[PDB]
Amino acid sequence: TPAFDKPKVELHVHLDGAIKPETILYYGKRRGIALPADTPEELQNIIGMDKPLTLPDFLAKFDYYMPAIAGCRDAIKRIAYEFVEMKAKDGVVYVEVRYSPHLLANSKVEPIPWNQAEGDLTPDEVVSLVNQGLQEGERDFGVKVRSILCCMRHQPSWSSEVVELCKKYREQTVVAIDLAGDETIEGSSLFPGHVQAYAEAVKSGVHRTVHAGEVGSANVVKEAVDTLKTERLGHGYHTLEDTTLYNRLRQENMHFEICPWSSYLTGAWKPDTEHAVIRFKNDQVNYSLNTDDPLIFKSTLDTDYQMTKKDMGFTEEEFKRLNINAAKSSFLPEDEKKELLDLLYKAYR
Ligand SMILES: C[C@H](O)[C@@H](CCOc1ccc2ccccc2c1)n1cnc(C(N)=O)c1
Ligand SMILES: [Zn+2]
């Protein structure tokens, strides 16, 4: 089978989109959750998509399974730990993982998410656990792992606590900020809570990535770059609809976090169309290949790779190239990027 049986780097995957179904059951059946069903095959098949959906229809999934994990300490710990594992079975050697800690919390968080009750798990505490899990999972599985904390676009009130967590826990495991969920709310890239957050990030040396351009216009991408000063774009596919912006982003070596399979499944790409990634490759962009949410997309990294291999003509040399871009564009300190990259090169020859 495997499309590209070599070392990979991955930079765009959500923790809470990367949970074993079996451990969602464990925790609902534990805590008393109630769930679309009670067998893992079923379970995947319902939080699995295989069809674009409305945003409603898509967020309701997070509504079922998140309350099995959010608020539980052994759960936060365990999903982080199990994820590292998943990724080693993918052949990843370095991953950045992102998530929102407020969306695992059930205390000093307002509004409390997921219809949860309060409870004694705070946002800060969540990231302690997660990274505990990533670390020991690093130790045992052999993947080198960092984490990215996510502001949410509809909730600029969390954004500076997001920033501060990143500073508080930086270089183990947290290496950067993200901005996530729902691009389409008007002006949200320019919400003062987000833009003071990303400026604080610049001020404190934390790395920036932003969602922009999976579902929003090229205007949102230009917001990510010019106002929030991102160093990388999550997805970025709509930047193609504005060509000076595409021209300038290709020329400041801007990194795109591509997610092929994520984008058919979501509708972000219409499948009658040049997939963004083939153009991106034709133009020699800086990009990665990425999973986004394997639970939801019924995926693995090899899924992504199979797609671009079988239907987009890609090729092991690009595969090698793009993973080398991922390593160059990682949020590691340079002494360790270079260590990442020298591993990759050796492996690639
Ligand atoms: C960032 C977190 O790690 C988490 C957030 C889950 O809850 C949400 C909440 C609101 C949203 C509104 C629009 C789009 C996605 C949303 C995801 N998450 C997981 N995957 C995604 C995604 N694919 O967009 C976002
Ligand atoms: Zn994402």
Side-chain angles (χ1 to χ4, degrees), residues 41-169:
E41 311 66 59
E42 253 302 56
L43 219 94
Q44 208 123 186
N45 274 232
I46 349 290
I47 75 243
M49 348 187 174
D50 63 321
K51 278 207 53 40
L53 313 168
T54 72
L55 189 183
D57 249 281
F58 173 93
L59 306 182
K61 302 169 174 313
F62 291 104
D63 282 292
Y64 328 96
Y65 68 79
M66 292 291 284
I69 308 281
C72 207
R73 344 192 149 215
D74 82 271
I76 316 304
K77 199 167 197 165
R78 158 126 82 94
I79 68 187
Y81 185 87
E82 304 184 318
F83 160 90
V84 197
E85 188 158 49
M86 300 163 91
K87 265 55 252 232
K89 323 184 195 168
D90 290 338
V92 182
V93 283
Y94 171 87
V95 58
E96 287 163 20
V97 65
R98 61 251 271 164
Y99 68 93
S100 171
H102 307 72
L103 302 180
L104 291 323
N106 70 7
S107 128
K108 3 232 110 281
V109 58
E110 205 290 341
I112 64 187
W114 316 120
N115 313 2
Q116 288 176 86
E118 55 159 329
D120 47 20
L121 225 178
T122 79
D124 195 285
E125 202 161 36
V126 176
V127 3
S128 230
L129 300 145
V130 169
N131 77 45
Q132 261 136 14
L134 283 2
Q135 274 163 173
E136 311 154 327
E138 161 154 359
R139 282 115 241 340
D140 306 344
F141 294 119
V143 188
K144 140 78 142 210
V145 181
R146 309 297 241 248
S147 50
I148 301 197
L149 284 8
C150 296
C151 316
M152 300 300 289
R153 290 214 188 246
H154 75 289
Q155 189 80 231
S157 55
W158 296 335
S159 265
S160 75
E161 175 188 348
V162 192
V163 285
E164 291 303 330
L165 264 357
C166 306
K167 276 144 35 102
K168 190 185 172 176
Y169 288 106

Side-chain angles (χ1 to χ4, degrees), residues 12-14 98 178 180 211 214 235 259 292-293:
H12 199 115
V13 60
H14 302 242
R98 61 251 271 164
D178 181 58
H211 282 64
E214 162 190 53
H235 309 261
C259 307
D292 216 356
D293 307 83

